[PDB]
Every structure is written in C-alpha cells, then in structure tokens.
Amino acid sequence: TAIYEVMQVRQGIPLFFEAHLERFVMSASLVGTRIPKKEAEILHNIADLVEKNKCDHGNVKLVSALMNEKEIFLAYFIPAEFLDSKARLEGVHTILFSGERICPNIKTIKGSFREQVKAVRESSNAYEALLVNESGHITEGSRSNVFFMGKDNKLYTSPAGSVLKGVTRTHVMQICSRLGLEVLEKTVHTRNLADIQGAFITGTTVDVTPVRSIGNTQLDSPNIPLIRKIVAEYEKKIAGYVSKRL
Numbered sequence: 001t002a003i004y005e006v007m008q009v010r011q012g013i014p015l016f017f018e019a020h021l022e023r024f025v026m027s028a029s030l031v032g033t034r035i036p037k038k039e040a041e042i043l044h045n046i047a048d049l050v051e052k053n054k055c056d057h058g059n060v061k062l063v064s065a066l067m068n069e070k071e072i073f074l075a076y077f078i079p080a081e082f083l084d085s086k087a088r089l090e091g092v093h094t095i096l097f098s099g100e101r102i103c104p105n106i107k108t109i110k111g112s113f114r115e116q117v118k119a120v121r122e123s124s125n126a127y128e129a130l131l132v133n134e135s136g137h138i139t140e141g142s143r144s145n146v147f148f149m150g151k152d153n154k155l156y157t158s159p160a161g162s163v164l165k166g167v168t169r170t171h172v173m174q175i176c177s178r179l180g181l182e183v184l185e186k187t188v189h190t191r192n193l194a195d196i197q198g199a200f201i202t203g204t205t206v207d208v209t210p211v212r213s214i215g216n217t218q219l220d221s222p223n224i225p226l227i228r229k230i231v232a233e234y235e236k237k238i239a240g241y242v243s244k245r246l
Contacts, residue, residue: 002065002109003027006078006143006204009058012050013245015204015238017043019167027106028064033071035064045075053077059205063109081127083209088231091210091222092127094141094201095120096190100133104140104163111164113142128201130214137162137187144203145169146211148188148196149224156192159185168202168234175233181226193217198224200231208234 005024007014014020021039028035037045046060055077063074083092097120101111117129128141140146140163148156155176157169176183188196198221199211208231210221221227 001031002063002067003031004064004107004109004112005062007046007060007062008204008207009046009050009056009060010238010242011246012047012056013242014043014046014060015241016167016171019170020204023107023167024062024064030106031108033064033066036071036073042075049075049077057082065109081205083127083206087127088209089222091212091219092201093125093213094128094130094199094211095124095126095215096132096138097129097142099131100139101131101164105161105165107164117142127209128206128211132190133162135187136190138190138192139163141201141203141206144201144206144209145172146199146201147172147183148192149198149221149227150192151195151197153197153226155181155183155226156186156188157183158188162187166203168204168206168208171234171237172202172208172230175230175237179229179233181230197221198227200227207231207238 005020007020058080059078061076061078065072097117099113103111113131121129128144130138130141130146132138139158145163145166150156173183193214198219200221201209210227211219212222213219
C-alpha cells in the first residue's frame with residue numbers, strides 16, 4: 001500500500017539522511033515500489049522545500065505508494081512538536097495505548113498510530129503513547145522507540161523484530177556500545193512498570209527524551225546520570241553531523 005520516512009531538518013541539514021534514505025529505499029524494494037528519484041534529487045527536493053517553506057528547522061516527510069495501481073512520491077513539511085528547554089529538562093508524560101503494528105519492521109502509513117492516539121495524547125498532555133500488544137508487552141511509541149531502566153540499573157528495549165528499528169534507536173545502541181552500557185533486548189510487560197526506575201523515548205521527531213511518567217507511574221528518568229549521558233552523547237552526534245555539512 002504505502003510507506004513513509006520522516007527526517008529532522010536542523011540549520012537546513014536533513015539529519016542522518018543516508019540512514020533514512022537507505023531504510024526508505026530498502027522498504028520500497030520490499031513492498032515492490034522503487035522510488036523514482038536518486039539521493040541527489042531527493043536531497044534537492046528537500047533543499048527546494050527548505051528554500052520555499054522559508055524556516056530552517058522542522059520535519060520533512062517522504063511518502064512512497066502505489067495508488068489505483070500507479071506509483072507516487074511526495075515530500076512535504078509536517079508540524080514539528082519541538083520540546084523547549086524546560087520540557088527537555090523535566091522530561092515528558094506518556095500514556096499506554098492498546099495496539100499492534102502489522103509489519104512492524106517497515107514504516108507503513110497503515111502501521112502509524114499518530115491519528116489513533118492524537119485525542120488521548122491531547123487530553124492527557126502526553127508527548128507520546130506507548131503501544132501495548134495483545135500479550136501486554138510495551139513495544140514502542142507511536143513515533144518512537146522506548147528504552148527502560150530497571151531498578152537493577154540495566155537498560156532494556158523491545159527486540160528489533162517486534163518494533164520499527166529506528167535510526168535513533170540504532171544511534172543510541174551505538175552510544176551505549178561505545179560507552180560499555182549493556183542493553184538487553186527483551187519483551188517488557190506492563191507488569192514490569194513496577195520494576196523500572198526510568199525510561200526514555202528515541203526518534204527523529206523526539207531526539208532522546210527522558211520520560212517523567214507512564215500513566216500514573218512516576219519515574220526519576222530526567223535525574224538518572226546514564227539517561228542524561230545518552231541525551232548528551234546524542235546531541236553531540238547531531239552537532240557533528242550538522243557541523244560537517246554547514
């Protein structure tokens with residue numbers, strides 16, 4: 001049916017463009033619709049939206065579909081929920097939502113919970129909804145991966161086969177690896193929310209954001225050194241990437 005990709009633009013630079021393009025191109029091959037445009041041409045369409053839409057920061061969405069049996073490529077800015085200063089410090093409220101993504105390894109329009117979770121997010125002032133499958137496992141956010149810190153001080157995240165393997169999740173795994181931080185890839189159950197001390201979400205539209213609460217479970221995530229460290233390392237990674245290309 002239809003796949004999409006979202007890239008964060010900072011100082012007119014699409015962040016981790018090669019990683020996002022590689023995923024989009026590979027998914028297209030699998031769902032059976034090559035993208036018309038080369039890397040060069042796509043990077044040019046984004047520059048033309050950057051120049052034309054005037055602002056230097058925001059989120060660009062690419063869409064590849066087959067509609068009434070013919071091939072479509074769209075590129076457009078979407079509304080950006082940039083977190084301010086204070087929200088980055090205090091961390092965010094999250095809620096649980098029941099759902100499963102069909103074909104979770106591919107960023108399908110049909111697999112997007114954005115529209116489904118919008119009203120519960122707005123009502124609860126939640127920055128993200130964490131999706132809970134038929135067996136009670138917390139898998140991922142609507143637009144993010146989620147990591148948990150146990151009261152055992154170990155990091156857990158849902159195994160890569162059960163979620164979208166986010167570009168951001170991949171960056172965080174590489175940070176943790178480089179820092180000697182173990183990440184266990186294990187199914188985490190809503191039962192485990194009693195046994196965690198922290199959580200953070202990861203994604204193109206959320207960077208690495210510490211979670212202050214999951215429903216009425218309060219967490220200390222914004223004060224945990226290792227979460228602060230992953231946030232700081234990820235920010236350094238963006239700064240380097242933007243630096244090289246400016």
